[PDB]
Structures are given as C-alpha cells and as structure tokens.
Amino acid sequence: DKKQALLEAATQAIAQSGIAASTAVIARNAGVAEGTLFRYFATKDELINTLYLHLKQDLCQSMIMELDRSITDAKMMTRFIWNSYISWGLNHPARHRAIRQLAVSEKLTKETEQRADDMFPELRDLCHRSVLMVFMSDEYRAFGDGLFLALAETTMDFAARDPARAGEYIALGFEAMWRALTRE
Amino acid sequence: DKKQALLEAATQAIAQSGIAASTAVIARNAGVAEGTLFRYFATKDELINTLYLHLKQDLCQSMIMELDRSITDAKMMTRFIWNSYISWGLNHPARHRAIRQLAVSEKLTKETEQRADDMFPELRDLCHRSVLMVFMSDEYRAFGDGLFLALAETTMDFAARDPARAGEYIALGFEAMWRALTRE
Ligand SMILES: C[C@H](CCC(=O)O)[C@H]1CC[C@H]2[C@@H]3[C@H](O)C[C@@H]4C[C@H](O)CC[C@]4(C)[C@H]3CC[C@]12C
Numbered sequence: 001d002k003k004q005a006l007l008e009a010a011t012q013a014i015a016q017s018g019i020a021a022s023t024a025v026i027a028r029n030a031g032v033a034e035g036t037l038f039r040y041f042a043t044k045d046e047l048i049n050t051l052y053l054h055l056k057q058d059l060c061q062s063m064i065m066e067l068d069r070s071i072t073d074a075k076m077m078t079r080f081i082w083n084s085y086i087s088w089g090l091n092h093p094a095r096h097r098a099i100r101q102l103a104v105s106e107k108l109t110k111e112t113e114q115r116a117d118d119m120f121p122e123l124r125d126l127c128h129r130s131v132l133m134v135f136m137s138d139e140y141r142a143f144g145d146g147l148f149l150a151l152a153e154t155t156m157d158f159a160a161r162d163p164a165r166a167g168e169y170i171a172l173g174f175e176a177m178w179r180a181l182t183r184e
Numbered sequence: 185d186k187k188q189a190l191l192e193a194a195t196q197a198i199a200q201s202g203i204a205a206s207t208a209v210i211a212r213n214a215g216v217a218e219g220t221l222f223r224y225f226a227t228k229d230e231l232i233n234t235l236y237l238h239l240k241q242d243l244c245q246s247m248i249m250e251l252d253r254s255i256t257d258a259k260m261m262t263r264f265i266w267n268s269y270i271s272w273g274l275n276h277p278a279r280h281r282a283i284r285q286l287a288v289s290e291k292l293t294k295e296t297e298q299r300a301d302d303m304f305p306e307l308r309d310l311c312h313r314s315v316l317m318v319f320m321s322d323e324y325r326a327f328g329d330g331l332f333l334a335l336a337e338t339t340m341d342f343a344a345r346d347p348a349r350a351g352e353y354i355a356l357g358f359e360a361m362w363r364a365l366t367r368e
C-alpha cells in the first residue's frame with residue numbers, strides 16, 4: 001500500500017520537477033510522514049533507483065503482453081516494441097516523463113541496470129535483442145537512450161495532439177528512430 | 185528599447201511556461217504596463233508570431249556568420265548548420281526552449297513562415313537547401329521540425345552536462361539527425 005502510494009507520488013513529482021523533487025512533497029502527496037518515506041527509501045539516490053526499476057518493470061510488463069514471439073525479424077520486433085512504448089507513454093504520461101529523467105540521471109547504479117535485465121529474461125532472447133545502438137561505445141549508451149526517449153516523446157506529443165493521424169506519427173517516428181540508432 | 189525588452193521577457197516566459205505564459209507576467213518582467221504590451225502585440229497569437237520571427241532572425245544571423253559558402257556538399261553544409269544550432273542553443277538556452285515551443289505551436293501563420301525566408305535569402309541558395317525532410321508530405325513538416333528540435337535538445341543537454349565530450353555528442357547527434365531526416 002504505502003510503498004505503491006509513495007512510488008506513485010514520486011512518479012508524479014519527478015515528471016513535474018525532475019530528480020530534484022523533494023521527499024517532503026512526495027511524502028505528503030502519498031499521505032505519509034517524511035520519516036516514513038525514509039523507511040522505504042533512505043536516500044534520494046535510493047528512491048531514484050527503486051523508482052526507475054518500478055517504472056521499468058511496468059513498461060516491460062506492457063511490452064511482454066503486446067509481443068508476438070513468432071516474430072524473429074529484428075526490425076519488425078523493434079517496431080512492435082516502439083509501438084508499445086508509445087502506447088505506454090500516452091496511457092501514462094507521467095510514467096514516461098519520470099522514466100525519461102531517471103534514465104539519463106547519472107544516479108542509476110550498475111547494480112540497478114543489472115537488476116532490470118534479470119527481472120525480464122523474456123526481452124533478452126525472445127527478440128534476439130538489439131541491432132539497436134550496438135554501434136555506440138559504452139560511454140554513449142546513455143546518450144543513445146536519450147535520443148530514443150527524445151524521439152518517442154515527440155511522437156507521443158504529436159499523436160496526443162492529433163489523434164486522427166496517430167498511427168502516421170508513430171510510423172514516421174519509428175523510421176526516424178530506427179535509422180538514427182541502427183546500422184546494417 | 186521596450187520592444188526588445190518585451191521580446192526578451194516573452195522569451196524567458198515561454199521557455200519556462202510554454203505558449204500559455206501570461207502577458208501580465210511578460211509585461212511586468214519587461215517593466216511596462218500590460219496595456220503597453222498590447223500596443224506592441226495586441227494578441228497572444230501576434231506575440232507568438234512576432235517572437236518566433238525575432239528568434240528565428242537571431243538564430244539565422246548566427247548561422248550566416250559561421251557559414252563558409254565555398255562548401256557545396258549538402259551533408260557538410262548541413263553539419264555546419266547543425267553545429268551552429270547546437271552552439272546557439274547552448275549560448276542561449278531560453279531562446280532555444282522558446283523557439284522549440286513556438287515552432288510546433290500551430291499558431292504560426294502562413295504569412296509568418298513566408299516572412300522567415302524573405303528575411304534571409306542567404307540560406308535559400310548558398311546551400312542549395314534541403315535534402316532535409318524532403319521525403320515528408322507537407323502535413324508532417326511540423327513533426328519533422330519537432331524531431332529535429334528533439335534531437336538537438338538532447339545533444340545540447342549532454343554537451344552542457346559533459347563538456348569534455350561536447351564534440352562527440354554533437355557529431356553523434358548530427359549523424360542521428362541526418363539519418364532520421366534524409367533519404368539518398
Ligand atoms: C526492449 C528493447 C530491445 C529490443 C530491440 O532492439 O528490438 C529496448 C531497446 C531500447 C530500449 C529503451 C531505450 O534504451 C530507452 C529507455 C532507457 C530506459 O533506461 C528504459 C526505458 C527505455 C525506453 C528502454 C526500454 C527497452 C528498449 C525499448
């Protein structure tokens with residue numbers, strides 16, 4: 001209960017304010033004592049990592065349910081994964097806004113990145129993963145994650161504002177993302 | 185004086201708040217009466233269009249000064265234009281933030297788009313323009329402008345936060361933009 005309420009309140013606050021959002025704000029919006037928040041997350045760094053994992057789990061659970069694992073072709077599988085990301089963020093704009101800030105925050109621990117993958121094996125190799133961002137040195141993976149998230153946010157913005165052409169924006173954004181972030 | 189002060193104050197407000205920013209806020213921050221602001225811009229729509237042109241002039245004046253017109257190769261010329269855009273936005277983050285919101289606002293008049301080009305012929309054909317976004321139907325030009333601006337903002341974000349690798353981010357972002365938004 002209170003853990004879920006705190007994570008939901010942290011999601012809204014960071015979506016609105018960035019990793020800077022105050023624990024006090026988060027605690028009151030969750031209707032708990034700030035000391036109670038520290039019982040769940042002793043530090044802002046811990047809240048960042050725990051919240052990132054929470055949102056990442058939610059997102060990937062969404063992707064798992066839309067995925068058809070017959071599909072082996074990487075581009076097609078990647079299109080489906082994109083479309084599920086755009087859907088997720090249109091359904092949950094604060095989750096997207098929060099995860100975008102978390103993803104590029106530089107407070108994510110190697111432990112946490114590790115923890116993400118271990119929690120959804122299905123994504124590792126029911127796609128055969130990647131071609132996406134393989135060309136980049138390790139140091140620039142964060143930047144490529146930022147580029148992906150930038151493209152996706154724009155695609156969301158336009159689809160939300162002009163729903164009659166949502167599929168068109170999604171398809172154009174996909175093609176942009178894929179050309180940006182792959183090599184043949 | 186007062187026109188320039190109002191345009192500067194509108195730039196900060198929209199960068200912070202979006203096309204929604206209030207004229208009252210803009211007028212006080214410019215230290216003029218709100219009725220005085222209406223003498224310069226009778227409507228928020230007019231302020232949007234006049235401000236967009238103001239920022240667009242500033243940006244393109246920057247580009248004109250960095251441009252070497254010996255360069256005929258479109259990709260190289262486009263790289264230079266990108267690098268000058270990234271520089272401009274790092275030098276003037278509110279100008280970038282404001283122009284990004286204006287560019288996609290749907291309040292820009294055909295008259296204004298017309299007015300932009302007429303004001304800088306040098307950009308029309310000392311580059312031979314485009315290859316950029318030529319593939320898109322007219323209805324999606326705004327979306328492609330949004331994609332460009334999304335890529336550029338990210339490239340700025342990373343260059344500002346990690347100046348030691350600024351050129352690297354700029355070059356990677358360029359290549360992403362160019363692959364997204366051209367076809368051979
Ligand atoms: C699951 C697929 C990999 C499969 C493929 O390339 O086909 C990942 C490839 C790019 C990732 C996304 C990309 O790295 C940007 C974000 C990074 C953030 O840490 C997680 C959410 C992200 C939005 C993330 C979610 C997982 C995908 C969408």
Ligand SMILES: C[C@H](CCC(=O)O)[C@H]1CC[C@H]2[C@@H]3[C@H](O)C[C@@H]4C[C@H](O)CC[C@]4(C)[C@H]3CC[C@]12C
Pocket residue numbers: 240258261262265266269283287307311313314315316329330332333
């Ligand atoms: C001047 C060059 C065209 C030349 C070329 O393709 O080599 C334009 C191609 C893309 C444009 C940019 C792109 O359309 C996105 C923004 C749109 C906004 O209305 C003006 C600023 C913009 C940031 C704009 C400024 C002019 C360039 C940078």
